[PDB]
Write an enzyme that holds these catalytic residues in place. Structure first.
Site, mmCIF file in Angstrom:
data_model
loop_
_atom_site.group_PDB
_atom_site.id
_atom_site.type_symbol
_atom_site.label_atom_id
_atom_site.label_comp_id
_atom_site.label_asym_id
_atom_site.label_seq_id
_atom_site.Cartn_x
_atom_site.Cartn_y
_atom_site.Cartn_z
ATOM 1 N N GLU A 149 5.732 11.939 6.121
ATOM 2 C CA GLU A 149 5.071 13.342 5.575
ATOM 3 C C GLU A 149 5.083 14.203 6.807
ATOM 4 O OE1 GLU A 149 1.709 13.427 2.773
ATOM 5 O OE2 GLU A 149 2.362 11.519 2.002
ATOM 6 N N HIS A 187 -8.222 -1.881 11.637
ATOM 7 C CA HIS A 187 -7.975 -3.196 12.014
ATOM 8 C C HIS A 187 -7.026 -3.309 13.078
ATOM 9 C CE1 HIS A 187 -7.219 -7.214 12.195
ATOM 10 N NE2 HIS A 187 -8.200 -7.644 11.880
ATOM 11 N N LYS A 238 -14.004 -7.302 19.641
ATOM 12 C CA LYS A 238 -13.025 -5.894 19.613
ATOM 13 C C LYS A 238 -13.626 -4.622 20.207
ATOM 14 C CE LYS A 238 -11.079 -7.257 15.315
ATOM 15 N NZ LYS A 238 -10.433 -6.705 14.028
HETATM 16 N N1 LIG Z 1 -0.058 10.590 1.506
HETATM 17 C C1 LIG Z 1 -0.490 9.324 1.587
HETATM 18 O O1 LIG Z 1 -1.705 8.722 1.375
HETATM 19 C C2 LIG Z 1 0.387 8.278 1.200
HETATM 20 C C3 LIG Z 1 1.735 8.479 1.272
HETATM 21 C C4 LIG Z 1 2.670 7.377 1.009
HETATM 22 C C5 LIG Z 1 2.222 6.258 1.122
HETATM 23 N N2 LIG Z 1 0.995 5.619 1.546
HETATM 24 C C6 LIG Z 1 0.392 4.374 1.669
HETATM 25 O O2 LIG Z 1 -0.761 4.139 1.082
HETATM 26 C C7 LIG Z 1 -1.116 3.008 1.681
HETATM 27 C C8 LIG Z 1 -2.786 3.033 1.831
HETATM 28 O O3 LIG Z 1 -3.039 4.321 2.602
HETATM 29 P P1 LIG Z 1 -3.778 4.172 4.176
HETATM 30 O O4 LIG Z 1 -3.919 2.892 4.540
HETATM 31 O O5 LIG Z 1 -3.386 5.344 4.813
HETATM 32 O O6 LIG Z 1 -5.586 4.893 3.639
HETATM 33 P P2 LIG Z 1 -5.955 4.909 2.488
HETATM 34 O O7 LIG Z 1 -6.025 6.415 1.782
HETATM 35 O O8 LIG Z 1 -5.916 3.631 1.567
HETATM 36 O O9 LIG Z 1 -7.676 4.859 3.182
HETATM 37 C C9 LIG Z 1 -8.180 3.699 3.534
HETATM 38 C C10 LIG Z 1 -9.734 4.157 3.616
HETATM 39 O O10 LIG Z 1 -9.891 5.092 5.014
HETATM 40 C C11 LIG Z 1 -10.959 5.922 4.472
HETATM 41 N N3 LIG Z 1 -10.365 7.442 4.481
HETATM 42 C C12 LIG Z 1 -9.246 7.787 3.850
HETATM 43 N N4 LIG Z 1 -9.137 9.204 3.821
HETATM 44 C C13 LIG Z 1 -10.151 9.783 4.558
HETATM 45 C C14 LIG Z 1 -10.801 10.823 5.396
HETATM 46 N N5 LIG Z 1 -9.986 12.031 4.936
HETATM 47 N N6 LIG Z 1 -11.845 10.945 6.191
HETATM 48 C C15 LIG Z 1 -12.387 9.722 6.184
HETATM 49 N N7 LIG Z 1 -11.915 8.452 5.641
HETATM 50 C C16 LIG Z 1 -11.061 8.256 5.235
HETATM 51 C C17 LIG Z 1 -11.291 5.650 3.267
HETATM 52 O O11 LIG Z 1 -12.730 5.038 3.294
HETATM 53 C C18 LIG Z 1 -10.415 4.801 2.538
HETATM 54 O O12 LIG Z 1 -10.929 3.906 1.615
HETATM 55 C C19 LIG Z 1 -0.408 3.141 3.245
HETATM 56 O O13 LIG Z 1 0.414 1.853 3.243
HETATM 57 C C20 LIG Z 1 0.377 4.309 2.963
HETATM 58 O O14 LIG Z 1 1.587 4.071 3.571
HETATM 59 C C21 LIG Z 1 -0.192 6.806 1.598
HETATM 60 N N1 LIG Z 2 -11.212 -10.675 6.005
HETATM 61 C C1 LIG Z 2 -10.661 -9.374 6.354
HETATM 62 O O1 LIG Z 2 -11.234 -8.314 5.876
HETATM 63 C C2 LIG Z 2 -9.514 -9.373 7.329
HETATM 64 C C3 LIG Z 2 -9.167 -10.101 8.196
HETATM 65 C C4 LIG Z 2 -8.272 -10.058 9.113
HETATM 66 C C5 LIG Z 2 -7.459 -9.027 8.993
HETATM 67 N N2 LIG Z 2 -7.912 -7.902 8.261
HETATM 68 C C6 LIG Z 2 -7.004 -6.668 8.274
HETATM 69 O O2 LIG Z 2 -7.703 -5.609 7.972
HETATM 70 C C7 LIG Z 2 -6.860 -4.635 7.412
HETATM 71 C C8 LIG Z 2 -7.508 -3.831 6.462
HETATM 72 O O3 LIG Z 2 -7.871 -4.451 5.382
HETATM 73 P P1 LIG Z 2 -7.537 -4.267 3.827
HETATM 74 O O4 LIG Z 2 -6.208 -3.521 3.507
HETATM 75 O O5 LIG Z 2 -7.231 -5.742 3.100
HETATM 76 O O6 LIG Z 2 -8.803 -3.627 3.023
HETATM 77 P P2 LIG Z 2 -10.003 -2.955 3.381
HETATM 78 O O7 LIG Z 2 -10.904 -3.928 3.541
HETATM 79 O O8 LIG Z 2 -9.915 -1.875 4.565
HETATM 80 O O9 LIG Z 2 -10.573 -1.951 2.243
HETATM 81 C C9 LIG Z 2 -9.791 -1.008 1.704
HETATM 82 C C10 LIG Z 2 -10.306 -0.341 0.681
HETATM 83 O O10 LIG Z 2 -10.543 -1.230 -0.562
HETATM 84 C C11 LIG Z 2 -11.689 -1.169 -1.126
HETATM 85 N N3 LIG Z 2 -12.339 -2.156 -1.204
HETATM 86 C C12 LIG Z 2 -12.677 -3.249 -0.108
HETATM 87 N N4 LIG Z 2 -13.549 -4.343 -0.523
HETATM 88 C C13 LIG Z 2 -13.708 -4.133 -1.670
HETATM 89 C C14 LIG Z 2 -14.661 -4.826 -2.665
HETATM 90 N N5 LIG Z 2 -15.361 -5.842 -2.484
HETATM 91 N N6 LIG Z 2 -14.676 -4.292 -4.072
HETATM 92 C C15 LIG Z 2 -13.831 -3.111 -4.457
HETATM 93 N N7 LIG Z 2 -13.017 -2.225 -3.513
HETATM 94 C C16 LIG Z 2 -13.127 -2.792 -2.214
HETATM 95 C C17 LIG Z 2 -12.721 -0.160 -0.483
HETATM 96 O O11 LIG Z 2 -12.403 1.175 -0.881
HETATM 97 C C18 LIG Z 2 -11.965 0.071 0.889
HETATM 98 O O12 LIG Z 2 -12.067 1.185 1.558
HETATM 99 C C19 LIG Z 2 -5.684 -5.343 6.922
HETATM 100 O O13 LIG Z 2 -4.382 -5.331 7.264
HETATM 101 C C20 LIG Z 2 -6.177 -6.842 7.134
HETATM 102 O O14 LIG Z 2 -5.091 -7.900 7.348
HETATM 103 C C21 LIG Z 2 -8.819 -8.241 7.544
HETATM 104 N N1 LIG Z 3 -8.221 -11.498 15.591
HETATM 105 C C1 LIG Z 3 -8.735 -11.368 14.081
HETATM 106 C C2 LIG Z 3 -9.763 -10.460 13.711
HETATM 107 C C3 LIG Z 3 -10.181 -10.361 12.292
HETATM 108 C C4 LIG Z 3 -11.289 -9.542 12.141
HETATM 109 C C5 LIG Z 3 -11.622 -9.247 10.557
HETATM 110 C C6 LIG Z 3 -12.769 -8.315 10.345
HETATM 111 C C7 LIG Z 3 -13.019 -8.207 8.894
HETATM 112 N N2 LIG Z 3 -14.278 -7.436 8.490
HETATM 113 C C8 LIG Z 3 -14.698 -7.218 7.274
HETATM 114 N N3 LIG Z 3 -14.062 -7.308 6.239
HETATM 115 N N4 LIG Z 3 -16.015 -6.667 7.096
#
Ligand SMILES: NC(=O)c1ccc[n+]([C@@H]2O[C@H](COP(=O)([O-])OP(=O)(O)OC[C@H]3O[C@@H](n4cnc5c(N)ncnc54)[C@H](O)[C@@H]3O)[C@@H](O)[C@H]2O)c1
Ligand SMILES: NC(=O)c1ccc[n+]([C@@H]2O[C@H](COP(=O)([O-])OP(=O)(O)OC[C@H]3O[C@@H](n4cnc5c(N)ncnc54)[C@H](O)[C@@H]3O)[C@@H](O)[C@H]2O)c1
Ligand SMILES: NCCCCCCCNC(N)N
Ligand SMILES: NC(=O)c1ccc[n+]([C@@H]2O[C@H](COP(=O)([O-])OP(=O)(O)OC[C@H]3O[C@@H](n4cnc5c(N)ncnc54)[C@H](O)[C@@H]3O)[C@@H](O)[C@H]2O)c1
Ligand SMILES: NC(=O)c1ccc[n+]([C@@H]2O[C@H](COP(=O)([O-])OP(=O)(O)OC[C@H]3O[C@@H](n4cnc5c(N)ncnc54)[C@H](O)[C@@H]3O)[C@@H](O)[C@H]2O)c1
Ligand SMILES: NCCCCCCCNC(N)N
Ligand SMILES: NCCCCCCCNC(N)N
Ligand SMILES: NCCCCCCCNC(N)N
Lengths: 324, 336, 324, 336
Positions: C98, C249, C290
């Site tokens: 974007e 992460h 971390k």
């Molecule tokens: N414009 C877009 O959002 C867009 C466009 C194309 C693809 N995608 C894809 O969607 C996937 C998920 O998007 P993401 O991982 O960037 O994040 P997300 O939008 O899933 O947000 C993850 C978390 O970040 C926090 N967050 C989000 N917006 C926030 C804000 N304005 N202020 C504070 N906290 C905030 C929220 O708790 C949210 O649950 C990505 O793989 C991305 O490439 C997104």
């Molecule tokens: N155990 C772990 O959480 C873990 C371990 C190793 C690596 N990581 C890494 O952390 C990164 C971010 O994690 P993610 O993308 O899996 O999601 P995340 O935990 O960041 O969550 C993304 C959003 O999903 C929603 N969500 C999360 N838990 C939920 C629940 N129990 N019920 C309903 N909604 C929920 C929330 O709005 C949250 O903001 C990943 O790339 C992952 O590989 C995570």
């Molecule tokens: N070196 C691997 C680190 C993995 C950390 C995962 C933390 C996940 N924490 C929550 N899901 N609350």
């Protein structure tokens, strides 16, 4: 050291076993499991052998926000009150009036996204994803006015000093319908506190009525004495609080008066970061003396419309035999 | 059609320009920009003269507060008085920028207590057992010593004695608003919201005034000096009449709960507010009144169909001082 | 022991003083104040005298979710990158594409409540309260295809081993526009990591392109080595993370490799109760290594569209002189 | 027009009736009821025979997984594999009830690690310093000992050696899905989600597979045995083709982030999913993709205009096992 493990559906579907497995599932499922344990501890303490309400071994305060009475959780709460399973109710004004209104006309399912302009043009009021037709309130008005007339007459000639709890008891007696929470509350001498009883449709009605029949006074001071003494003279107390706001603080502050509740379960969708009382964890209440330091309180972070019926299934409804 | 564009710091830290750029930044920044516009619309209306016809109708209440073309209701949860937002609210009240206050009981008592002793910064994670053992009470990431409430008891008890005597010998019929005015007069301190409210004839409504420390005190007091009555019915008439006889109304509501509903419901009595800004951290999904969008209130008639209300989804401790800076504080000259 | 006190508007409006007062205002205003302090500590460490990127005394990792590039926060981030104020970027795929698309066509303001059916019928895509016309992506396609052709040619004949960071550098060079974050990133040798670069429109385009010109490979292994070594060889590190998910992460786990970041500021709207990594407090990261045990990390619980420009105003933009 | 009414416990604890009553209870209970209906619609479609015409079109992918009338995508955040929801997902995968999995890297590795050592219950408030000092890592209110990852290293390193050798001597072109299948085959344990996924030819996509412990291991491994490539481009082709050649699709998405977008975006390629259920704790106000309502996805073409998608706003650890009990588990006989 308890291992994380979810319910295995290769067992088939035993709903009791499924609910039990929440405890080892983690996150809020684990908190739900802990809540079941804490409420069961309250119940078991209450069943131990030792206001016109006779004392038991654990006084349970049940609080709930108004919208939970808009919801089907009205039925859940009514069940507990009907069977004398709790001792004190606290709810905000909507939580009083909508129980009564539901004996006159139903609330309907809708959707959160419905636009206000079109709803208002069609005489429909929105409560989340629920809908209440204007006509429900017209029926409430018709039912309530002659009761308010009697209340004013009783105040000015029979010396009755009205408070929210006394009004709620009277409205429950008047609705005279076993679907009603407050019908059962008054029948079973369970007091209901609602210090801001004017904040809703019952308020609207009192307001309109007062220009046709001035004089009604609702005192909140005597009701404070009444709720606080429910806590002060308890052998033990438990708090079950659905939602936040007045209902949460009012119950918790009553328990400060005895130097804290023995058991506490919160189910609410608030969070601490905004400094809100609604969002405060149970451990904040410990700093104040509202929850005893040796208590093991629990908060479930979830919509009570999902969680409360499951909690009741695994707690109060299991001990139905002992409550009869 | 407005393009998304954030503030460009290559222009330097031009704060006014930075704040204006929130409007085109998106998400809650854009809602902040919309809130600034909506509050400025309330202010612009308020400063508009009343015509003969409008003056006649607006003058139909018994309150001695001078008439304006827009009656502004300001609501806030108790914790916002625990916070430094107390100073923001006091400023607005001091300068007659709003017309009606609604807060819960904490939001009354803690303003008064802050004239006696300060509240301190802490942290959310501090454990209750150790705080309790050291005589400290936690409000989020703030801390209030036990001693603050001892000082409040010492100050308040003699006032409660006078109130009971005035009730019983002079026929005073107390309500929360009347009590809050009296407490403001008694505190006699220009740092107090309620001092300024009573001085400027701005009524304060709090129908559950017993839900806090003021309640604790009333409760203890009642065993030595029984019979104080606080009627909430008269206060309902008083708040609703403020809305019914307004030329226009605006609602500025910080947080949810009683404060939000009580203001909005008063405005239903005039078939809806003309302007509305909510700043709160609640969400709609739980069915809560706190989390209901402004457009829910439109279905009830609490906000006019033609209104363009705004909700900012954020902690008011961040947003409200910025909002005031860009609205009321810009027109301070008109309010003196 | 710092007393709670808000800004007094009887002083008039000094915006610097107003922002400073957040620190003593409480709740998230206080956290904002703490964040300003922590970011200023990073900057001051970075300005202390001691991959082709030359090392400074503090390596700053900046992470942001994709939607923040949809927003005007794109401009805020671009400014920091333009002036070499941060050292490593992490964003998800939307956060890459974007920025590029905005050099071709604008994103517009809309409303959250706009209905999907009518938007789709009019060729408009919704991002929260923003709107992106279909035509923006048509322009992106037209611009991108000949670049992807060159990338495949360079891979198969010049031995280029593509990864997300290398692709992002190339796309930034190609867009050749000083409004672009990634134009500045590549000019200033600031690497950008995005392991799931296929998750978005750039993915769509790579997908469509691959049937016209097969062969493109994007390796994520080498990019892991690259980000982790940015942390391992740093004198000090700071993390500024806007939002959650992969971006949070990935930065935090890179810093685990050096046994933890020295400074950390989170600004996100997630909460811990769901067990999410997004919602985990900084103190969870301390358990993993971390964030260093002696660090004083800060989380602001708020929409970064409100908070980040204010944070930059009080930190990086104040030290503009030192960055030139 | 359906009336609001909760379950009446005077009828006793009839659990099936209790769960059905969620639909008329309101707020998220009602959304749960709607989600049950929507998943049952996916299942009913899945069990419908393919006509000649539909079979022809559905058979146009190279995957050997048998064809059904509804291709179901199941997405979940990593933490849900940390949780006991791992068991729920494993059951669905074991019995071929879903067709494509998407999870982030944690959601792969922790399934494998749980075959080597357990995860334990803890509490959110436990302090990081003391946990770190005792070699314990926190995941929300769960706890993972350092030793779990040591065991993972011991198990995984020899597999990584074989993968590099197969790449360099046999021309294997690794992608995350191919790696996840191999790891599932290697773990060789019926408690593993990925064991069952590879056995049943259910592909697993995870485009940021390096973001976690599996990444840590790959990273350390690469200094002794360099050159492993994980291509994400081929995996994009593979996931998108699963949607493009489906007769119908359903999406069941737990949590947000990459897992949600990646599934939804694949379904854009067929001009939208026919059925969709989101269960997540995100909200729309921050502009996040995670918090976007299903109706946002309709604007993009990720969900069909004629679809009736549902979001339940709740922690999936509470909701998902209930959902499965009322949907997939009811039709288990058809899946064997
Ligand atoms: N414009 C877009 O959002 C867009 C466009 C194309 C693809 N995608 C894809 O969607 C996937 C998920 O998007 P993401 O991982 O960037 O994040 P997300 O939008 O899933 O947000 C993850 C978390 O970040 C926090 N967050 C989000 N917006 C926030 C804000 N304005 N202020 C504070 N906290 C905030 C929220 O708790 C949210 O649950 C990505 O793989 C991305 O490439 C997104
Ligand atoms: N155990 C772990 O959480 C873990 C371990 C190793 C690596 N990581 C890494 O952390 C990164 C971010 O994690 P993610 O993308 O899996 O999601 P995340 O935990 O960041 O969550 C993304 C959003 O999903 C929603 N969500 C999360 N838990 C939920 C629940 N129990 N019920 C309903 N909604 C929920 C929330 O709005 C949250 O903001 C990943 O790339 C992952 O590989 C995570
Ligand atoms: N070196 C691997 C680190 C993995 C950390 C995962 C933390 C996940 N924490 C929550 N899901 N609350
Ligand atoms: N039906 C109605 O909601 C209704 C009707 C008439 C008047 N009112 C008035 O509105 C005022 C404010 O209402 P309130 O104090 O009852 O609460 P509220 O609706 O303001 O909720 C307060 C907090 O409780 C929590 N909560 C709400 N619903 C929840 C749920 N389903 N599950 C878990 N947590 C939940 C939320 O965090 C919310 O912010 C009251 O004075 C009331 O009389 C409400
Ligand atoms: N300092 C105190 O908080 C305090 C002190 C004594 C008594 N009490 C009593 O607690 C009861 C409940 O308190 P309440 O009704 O004032 O509100 P509350 O703190 O329960 O909050 C209600 C809702 O308002 C919103 N909100 C809260 N803080 C916010 C913020 N900083 N920014 C944006 N939105 C926010 C949240 O969604 C919250 O769920 C009252 O009866 C009060 O008298 C509170
Ligand atoms: N006896 C008076 C008790 C007052 C307690 C107020 C607690 C408020 N807590 C938050 N707002 N977080
Ligand atoms: N005049 C009475 C008005 C009652 C309005 C209640 C609205 C409740 N809305 C929720 N979402 N709870
Ligand atoms: N084919 C590309 C689809 C991109 C969709 C991005 C939607 C982002 N929505 C938010 N609310 N962030």
């Amino acid at each position: 050291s308890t291992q994380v493990r979810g319910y295995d559906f290769n067992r088939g579907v035993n709903y009791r076993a499924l609910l039990e497995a929440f405890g080892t599932t983690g996150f809020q499922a684990t908190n739900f499991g802990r809540a079941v344990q804490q409420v069961n501890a309250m119940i078991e303490k209450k069943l131990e052998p030792l206001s016109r309400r006779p004392l038991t071994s654990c006084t349970i305060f049940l609080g709930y926000t108004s919208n939970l009475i808009s919801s089907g959780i009205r039925e859940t709460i009514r069940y507990l009150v009907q069977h004398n399973m709790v001792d004190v109710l606290v709810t905000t004004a909507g939580g009083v009036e909508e129980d009564l209104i539901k004996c006159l006309a139903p609330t309907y399912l809708g959707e959160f996204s419905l636009r206000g302009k079109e709803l208002r043009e069609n005489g429909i009021n929105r409560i989340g994803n629920l809908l209440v037709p204007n006509e429900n309130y017209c029926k409430f008005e018709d039912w309530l006015m002659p009761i308010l007339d009697q209340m004013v007459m009783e105040q000015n000639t029979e010396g009755v000093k009205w408070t929210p709890s006394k009004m709620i008891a009277r409205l429950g007696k008047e609705i005279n319908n076993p679907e009603s929470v407050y019908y059962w509350a008054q029948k079973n001498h369970i007091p209901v506190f609602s210090p801001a009883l004017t904040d809703g449709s019952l308020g609207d009605m009192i307001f309109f009525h007062s220009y046709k029949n001035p004089g009604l006074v609702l005192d909140i001071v005597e009701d404070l004495r009444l709720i606080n003494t429910q806590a002060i003279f308890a052998k033990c107390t438990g708090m079950i609080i659905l939602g936040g706001g007045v209902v949460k603080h009012h119950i918790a502050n009553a328990n400060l008066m005895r130097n804290g509740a023995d058991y506490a379960v919160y189910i609410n969708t608030a969070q601490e970061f905004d400094g809100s009382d609604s969002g405060a964890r149970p451990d904040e209440a410990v700093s104040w003396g509202k929850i005893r330091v040796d208590a093991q309180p629990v908060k479930v972070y979830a919509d009570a419309s999902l969680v409360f019926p499951l909690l009741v299934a695994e707690t109060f409804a299991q001990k139905m035999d002992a409550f009869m």
